[PDB]
Amino acid sequence: GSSGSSGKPEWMMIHRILNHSVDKKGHVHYLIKWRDLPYDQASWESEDVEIQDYDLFKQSYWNH
């Protein structure tokens, strides 16, 4: 599955990619909506952040 000591918890989930934005630097960011937290609490997470099935969500939102 997924290994690594320093990464991310289990409670942290990704409801659905609200939107995406590319900072002036270039790094692509994806507005992740922490299922637990509401939409008003949502936060911006770069495309580097390691989250459960993070690559899948990003791949999906894009295709669709």
From Swiss-Prot:
Signal peptide feature range: none
Domain Chromo, first and last residues per copy: 12-64
Superkingdom per UniProt: Eukaryota
Cross-link (Glycyl lysine isopeptide (Lys-Gly) (interchain with G-Cter in SUMO2)): K8
Localization terms from the record: Nucleus; Cytoplasm, Cytoskeleton, Microtubule organizing center, Centrosome
Tissue: Widely expressed.
Misc remark: One of the main antigens reacting with anti-MI-2 positive sera of dermatomyositis.
Written domain comment of the UniProt record: The KIKL motif recognizes and binds the NET domain of BRD3.
UniProt similarity note: Belongs to the SNF2/RAD54 helicase family.
Associated disease: Sifrim-Hitz-Weiss syndrome: An autosomal dominant syndrome characterized by intellectual disability, variable congenital defects affecting cardiac, skeletal, and urogenital systems. Short stature, macrocephaly, hearing impairment, and facial dysmorphism are present in some patients.
Function summary: ATP-dependent chromatin-remodeling factor that binds and distorts nucleosomal DNA. Acts as a component of the histone deacetylase NuRD complex which participates in the remodeling of chromatin. Localizes to acetylated damaged chromatin in a ZMYND8-dependent manner, to promote transcriptional repression and double-strand break repair by homologous recombination. Involved in neurogenesis.
Subunit structure: Component of the nucleosome remodeling and deacetylase (NuRD) repressor complex, composed of core proteins MTA1, MTA2, MTA3, RBBP4, RBBP7, HDAC1, HDAC2, MBD2, MBD3, and peripherally associated proteins CDK2AP1, CDK2AP2, GATAD2A, GATAD2B, CHD3, CHD4 and CHD5. The exact stoichiometry of the NuRD complex is unknown, and some subunits such as MBD2 and MBD3, GATAD2A and GATAD2B, and CHD3, CHD4 and CHD5 define mutually exclusive NuRD complexes. Interacts with IKFZ1; the interaction is direct and when in part of the NuRD complex. Part of a complex containing ATR and HDAC2.
Protein name: Chromodomain-helicase-DNA-binding protein 4
Organism: Homo sapiens
Covered range of the whole protein: 618 to 674 of 1912
